[PDB]
Design a protein around this ligand. Structure first.
Ligand SMILES: CC(=O)O[C@H]1C[C@@]2(C)[C@@H](C[C@@H](O)[C@H]3[C@@]4(C)CC[C@@H](O)[C@@H](C)[C@@H]4CC[C@@]32C)/C1=C(\CCC=C(C)C)C(=O)O
Ligand SMILES: Nc1nc2c(ncn2[C@@H]2O[C@H](COP(=O)(O)OP(=O)(O)O)[C@@H](O)[C@H]2O)c(=O)[nH]1
Ligand SMILES: [Mg+2]
Ligand SMILES: [Zn+2]
Lengths: 666, 99, 208
RNA sequence: UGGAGAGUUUGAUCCUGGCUCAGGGUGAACGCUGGCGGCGUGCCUAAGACAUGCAAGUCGUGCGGGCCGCGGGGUUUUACUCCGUGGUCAGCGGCGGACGGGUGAGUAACGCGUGGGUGACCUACCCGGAAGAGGGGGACAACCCGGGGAAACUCGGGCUAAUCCCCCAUGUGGACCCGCCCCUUGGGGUGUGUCCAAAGGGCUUUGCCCGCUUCCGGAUGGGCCCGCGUCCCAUCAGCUAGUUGGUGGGGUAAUGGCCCACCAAGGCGACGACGGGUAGCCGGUCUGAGAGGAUGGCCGGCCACAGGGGCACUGAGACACGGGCCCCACUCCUACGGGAGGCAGCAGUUAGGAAUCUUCCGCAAUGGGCGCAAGCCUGACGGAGCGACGCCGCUUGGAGGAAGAAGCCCUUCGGGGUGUAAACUCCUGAACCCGGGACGAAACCCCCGACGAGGGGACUGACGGUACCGGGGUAAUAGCGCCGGCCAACUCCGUGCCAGCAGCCGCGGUAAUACGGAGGGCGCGAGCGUUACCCGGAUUCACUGGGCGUAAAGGG
């Protein structure tokens, strides 16, 4: 009554670029792994199945689309992966992206040739790209009986067994030996497999060069020994729609797809501070992670978790170290492709949902209620790319939008809400155009808030061009509290990035000692509302050189207006120039789309700075205004077909083209 | 899903249906009575009323009426009857009304 | 928990020598013997005149630090003596003295009260038979406070039960150095306790 | 057996006077810390909604069967398959589901509290007393057959039993109308008339046990009625038609406009009617010297409500929380023709909120329903779990040990402080280990007796291998507030009306005991602070215990 070996656990993820088949790939995985019949919706984050004595934990949701972050989190928590590929889309421009981000964490993955039955459906067409675009060492595991329309069956190279499909309803399959012709086409390949697999077992190498065939048991040993090293990428095939290449890709799983054991142990940190391997031991300290919270109308709040060490138990007591809380795990649950399996525990390496717990939000660490109060890794970093200007209509939808991101920032911490620290308006952070757009349906529908959707502002800077000298008097002598503060300065522009430089240039001291302090609060202060549009009149040097006083009428503040009347016109008489913020950037773009990327950067008011090769691409430096920068994530990803990404850092302020100076008078 | 206490409801209906009858009986009967009594049918009234009387106490046995419910009805029947037979009649036959 | 930490420090502050250490406090060094003055950085400076409050708080602490007891218990015991029929001053002391961990100190099975407690705590003590380990336990009139048997022969017990042969024990306690017994004759009286503490002030402390 | 004041209006004074603080309390939350145990206690908000599971049943000693396992087989063989007993399934009938458990929405009211009245009534089961249990008929499920349905179930024939129903008898005796007697609101008698009883089971079978019927009495539990007491607003002053009374009916266990008919104009109100706001009331709880002031959580009593609302049925009792009907709102199934529901029961889910627990173990004990018993049900209860939420007890060590290490701080640089503190030296030994290990449980039952007294015997532990006991046993968790005055406890450095503090007065603008850190100190200690709210201080709404010439206050 063991039932749990660990070496039978398969936690895979179906990640690929849109169109593909991911979803269709899974609703199918779960039909074969369980059609039982014996004489007796992605219903939740992660789901379990049993394929010939192995438990598989799948986390299908990827999508790839602009924003990933979900594809990359599941990936962490789970073992293997299947980058499903559209066999059809041959001149496929986005077959990419996905995989180039998987080894980016370090995880093994096979590839799937999906729509083999759809026009242009060519197997090699992909390997002729799967090694051309990304550069892996795939192994044509099968060959097609009839390309595209003539899709009857398929043949295993490694095992030289022929299979056929009498239909697409998934019923009349069978294994009929190789059909007359073909046959020969095989060999050469079943040797190349028994040749590639030689780079692993030197035992399948010698018997190759002697005249003996490697036993069906060790041959796979080579293939699998190395697949799991991230060296080989077993590519198979089959119309997920017509039920072909599936039940043979399900073997493709177990046989080469890692087990929780086969994978490199988690790192975390103790209360003191130091790394440590979280050993997948069903008897080591309890320490798992929580990723996807959910609201079940039947069991309330669910918290999906992946155990790395120890075992969780039904009717126990955990403790969230992240958010210092004694959560009470009251019941466990395993999501079955068609029902709720109420198990009694989650031994390390396994995953599921714990009914109960409250504070536990995305990626929290829970340890036994006494165990080393440690906190694992998790630390992912998918920041934003596309942001918007959301102004909540009257001061009414600014409260329907306040409780709009107080439940939409816990249910998705992959965005960033921040109030523009210069002009009210709040900025909704996104991971692409699709991210913010759909938050605009629910935050506008499921929250009934109806605010605004225009675009972000620019933090300009008032200033001048020519050095001027105006008077700074005040005097108000009617009889008493006089108010006598007179001054005269030397305001002169400085380089675009100087700041504020005041000069205490008075001879004998015609303006008292006590009164020059509060005369700097008038010049510094008054610089606030510019002489053009009204912005921070910076990048200038003040030089109080003159100005007189009175024995009684003068004040610690009468001199506050005196120096505030000298700055309030020295920038108006010295020709006021409306400067603006220029951001530095870098678009990692394949030099293939580099022609139209650097161009666009010019038809975008900017000037390019360089291109120093990087990897297989090339980075472009430059400066762009911020008015002419909005929605660039869907313009750069445009001139590059997704193969384009960029950064951005502030730099300096610079005058508007005299034509963007008579525009700003709004 | 359910509780076998409906046995109490089923029974309820019955018991209800039963005394619901002897109930209405004593009523109509009680009227047919006071009716004649006032009309003049001296002895042939008493007769009915003497019957009414039975039925009353009769139902008092079960859970229909009880205690004074019976007694009260009586004291009124043979009170309005006797107080209608003096509308010139002399209690002829030996009714319930005592000498 | 029973304070713990620098005591021949309190010995100071209060300025009225304390036997919180027992043996040592007698040698030319109860601390207060060498540096007779409030601890801290300042300590040896012209002390400002005590407020009407300071005085009473100070006298309370004094009395409380003697019996080394938490402010909570001290207060309860106080509040108890108050509602009790009899001159509250004496009565308060009455119970304070009944503390087992104290009757142990008095009967001499211990050098300090700090010690007497640890003894009582570790069941080295007994009451008319069964052993008690609650310092707070309150002795009645006519009880035998002996040392348990497993204890009888333990270095400490002897030495302490040794300096006894000769010395006398309070008029409300009869001790038998041999049988290591001891009766709580009558309830201690006012003078019997030559404490450098004025109760009338402590009383007035809890009057505010 | 009981009463403490202080800070703040002035240049200074006295008075009036407001603000503010020290105390105690809390179903508590928040912050920083957090070791053990015992006993308490834990949705104060949405009386918002709720997935799942369980919270009320039980008698074969009331009756007839269906199904299953035994006897002996009815007959000559299986036949018309009968019988006696032990499992079961539902149906009849019998009690119990009206108690127990939850909640405070409503309610200012005979709701509650208290003291009384019932010549105006009721009370299943339980005690004691009296007399009875005589004949007869009779249906409906169950069951068989047939029909409608998706389902829930439902309809139609035909059987059949009983403590189910019905008629006749006997009526100790009771119920009625009338008369007389005593009495005095309908209370007792008494005569004529009239009307009503009832059931059978088990055994050891002319004698018991459990039942039945009528009547009287007791006990317990109630209904209704009444005097008194029961918050804020007159910037709510007038209210009222079944309204107030009467007569006669109906109605009820019973009084009464509780209802209806018809008469009469009356009933209520500054002793605050009517209206509006708020609230469940009490025993008690907190505070207080007291008088008084708040309050009504847990425990006990009463009430009121079970999604909102109306209504009856059965019954001793309900207008019924896990009963019924209907309206409405919500949840679910649907073959869309119609169906099933009600956590303010236990546990849990979600929403709200600053905030309040396990979908736990046991019927061993107490208590309740049924039963002759055996026994069955029992989220009531007895326990365990989680939370310093509270209170009580306990540990983080004890005795030694320098004219006194180091580090750190202060310094007139002589030195002072931290301080016996550490170190170091012995000694006891929380934790933790092997071993032993309950009280709560002695009845129901069984045997003697007489199934009476009394005597003897047996089965019964969830907590729990827990508490506790003996042996073995390692020096083994401290924070938090404060340090200008009230108010215990000060120095240095940063800082420069900044940053910040702040309960009040106020502190901060280059030497700050007031900000920030440090050393040191004070208080208290598994706690310490903050925030709400109540009493106190506040004789500051003054009955105890104040005032009005100018302080607020005399009415033309
Ligand atoms: C079910 C699944 O696995 O992914 C689904 C579910 C999905 C990942 C969704 C994309 C995106 O909303 C995702 C976000 C982060 C969107 C922002 C928030 O609302 C999150 C709470 C939400 C979590 C999952 C969700 C809602 C999916 C899509 C959407 C595709 C849309 C288009 C127009 C092609 C997908 O997978 O293609
Ligand atoms: N012809 C064909 N179409 C397929 C196959 N598998 C998937 N598809 C189609 O691919 C489209 C997108 O499938 P889906 O898995 O939802 O895309 P994903 O969300 O990017 O994984 C749908 O139209 C599917 O029917 C296949 O094997 N053959
Ligand atoms: Mg998809
Ligand atoms: Zn000393």
């Amino acid at each position: 009554k063991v039932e749990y070996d660990l070496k039978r656990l398969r936690n895979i993820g179906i990640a690929a670029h849109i169109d593909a088949g991911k979803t269709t790939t899974t609703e199918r995985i779960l039909y074969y792994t369980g059609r039982i019949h014996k004489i007796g919706t992605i219903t939740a984050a992660v789901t379990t199945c049993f394929w010939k004595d192995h438990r598989i934990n799948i986390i299908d949701t990827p999508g790839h689309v602009d924003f990933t972050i979900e594809v990359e989190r599941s990936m962490r928590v789970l073992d293997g992966a299947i980058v499903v590929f559209d066999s059809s889309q041959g001149v496929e421009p986005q077959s990419e992206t996905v995989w180039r981000q998987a080894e980016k964490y370090k995880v093994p993955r096979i590839a799937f040739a999906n729509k083999m039955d759809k026009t242009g459906a060519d197997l090699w067409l992909v390997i002729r790209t799967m090694q051309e675009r990304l550069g892996a060492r795939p192994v044509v595991m099968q060959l097609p009986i009839g390309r595209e329309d003539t899709f009857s069956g398929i043949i295993d190279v490694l095992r030289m067994k022929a299979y056929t499909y009498g239909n697409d309803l998934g019923t009349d399959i069978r294994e009929i030996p190789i059909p007359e012709e073909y046959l020969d086409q095989a060999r050469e390949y079943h040797e190349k497999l028994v040749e590639v697999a030689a780079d692993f077992d030197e035992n399948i190498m010698l018997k190759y060069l002697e005249g003996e065939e490697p036993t069906e048991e060790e041959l796979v040993a080579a293939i699998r020994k190395g697949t799991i090293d991230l060296k080989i990428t077993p590519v198979f095939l089959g119309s997920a729609l017509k039920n072909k290449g599936v039940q043979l890709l399900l073997d493709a799983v177990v046989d080469y797809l890692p087990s929780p054991l086969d994978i490199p142990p988690i790192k975390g940190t103790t209360p003191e501070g130091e790394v440590v391997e979280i050993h997948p031991d069903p008897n080591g300290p309890l320490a798992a992670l929580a990723f996807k919270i959910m609201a079940d109308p039947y069991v309330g709040r669910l918290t999906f978790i992946r155990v790395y060490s120890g075992t969780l138990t039904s009717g126990s007591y955990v403790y969230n170290t992240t958010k210092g809380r004694k959560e009470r795990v009251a019941r466990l649950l395993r999501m079955h492709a068609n029902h709720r399996e109420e198990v009694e525990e989650l031994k390390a390496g396994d995953l599921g949902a714990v009914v109960g717990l409250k504070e536990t939000i995305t990626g929290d660490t829970l340890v036994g209620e006494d165990a080393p109060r440690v906190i694992l890794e998790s630390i992912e970093v998918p920041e934003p790319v596309i942001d918007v200007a959301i102004e909540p209509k009257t001061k009414a939808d600014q409260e329907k939008l306040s409780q709009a991101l107080a439940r939409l920032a816990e249910e998705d911490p992959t965005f960033r809400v921040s109030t523009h620290p210069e002009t009210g308006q709040t900025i909704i952070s996104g991971m692409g155009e699709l991210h913010l757009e759909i938050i605009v349906d629910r935050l506008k529908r499921e929250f009934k808030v109806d605010a605004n959707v225009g675009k972000p502002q620019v933090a300009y800077r008032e200033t001048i061009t020519k050095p001027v000298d105006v008077e700074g008097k005040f005097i108000r002598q009617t009889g008493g509290r006089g108010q006598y503060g007179h001054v005269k300065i030397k305001v002169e522009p400085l380089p675009r990035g100087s700041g504020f430089e005041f000069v205490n240039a008075i001879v004998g001291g015609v303006i008292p000692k006590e009164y020059i302090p509060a005369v700097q609060k008038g010049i510094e202060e008054a610089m606030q509302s510019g002489p053009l549009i009204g912005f921070p009149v910076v990048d200038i040097k003040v030089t109080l050189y003159d100005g007189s006083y009175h024995e009684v009428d003068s004040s610690e503040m009468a001199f506050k207006i005196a120096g505030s009347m000298a700055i309030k016109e020295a920038v108006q008489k010295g020709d006021p120039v409306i400067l603006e913020p220029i951001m530095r950037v870098e678009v990692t773009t394949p030099e293939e789309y580099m022609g139209d990327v650097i161009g666009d950067l010019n038809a975008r008011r900017g000037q390019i700075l360089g291109m120093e090769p990087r990897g297989n691409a090339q980075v472009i430096r430059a400066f762009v205004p911020l008015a002419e920068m909005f929605g660039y994530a869907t313009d750069l990803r445009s001139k590059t077909q997704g193969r384009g990404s960029f950064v951005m850092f502030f730099d300096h302020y610079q005058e508007v083209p005299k034509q963007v100076q008579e525009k700003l008078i709004k | 899903r359910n509780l076998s206490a409906l046995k109490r409801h089923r029974q309820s209906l019955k018991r209800r249906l039963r005394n619901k009858a002897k109930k209405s009986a004593i009523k109509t009967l009680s009227k047919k009575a006071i009716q004649l009594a006032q009309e003049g049918k001296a002895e042939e009234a008493l007769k009915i009323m003497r019957k009414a009387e039975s039925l009353i106490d009769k139902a008092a046995k079960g859970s229909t009426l009880h205690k004074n419910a019976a007694a009260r009805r009586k004291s009124r029947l043979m009170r309005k009857v006797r107080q209608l037979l003096e509308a010139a009649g002399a209690p002829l036959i030996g009714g319930g009304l005592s000498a | 928990g029973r304070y713990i930490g620098p005591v021949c420090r309190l010995c100071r502050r209060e300025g009225v020598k304390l036997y919180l250490k027992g043996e040592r406090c007698y040698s030319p060094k109860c601390a207060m013997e060498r540096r007779p003055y409030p601890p801290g950085q300042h300590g040896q400076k012209r002390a400002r005149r005590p407020s009407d409050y300071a005085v009473r708080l100070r006298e309370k602490q004094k009395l409380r630090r003697i019996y080394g007891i938490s402010e909570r218990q001290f207060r309860n015991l106080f509040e108890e003596a108050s509602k009790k029929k009899g001159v509250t001053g004496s009565v308060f002391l009455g119970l304070l003295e009944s503390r087992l961990d104290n009757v142990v100190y008095r009967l001499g099975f211990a050098v300090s009260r700090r010690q007497a407690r640890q003894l009582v705590r570790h069941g080295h003590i007994t009451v008319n038979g069964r052993r008690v380990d609650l310092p707070s336990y309150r002795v009645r009139p006519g009880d035998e406070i002996a040392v348990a048997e497993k204890s009888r022969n333990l270095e400490l017990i002897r030495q302490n039960l040794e300096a006894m042969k000769g010395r006398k024990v309070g008029p409300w306690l009869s001790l038998d150095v041999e049988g290591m017994k001891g009766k709580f004759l009558r309830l201690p009286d006012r003078e019997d306790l030559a404490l450098p503490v004025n109760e009338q002030l402590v009383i007035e402390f809890y009057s505010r």
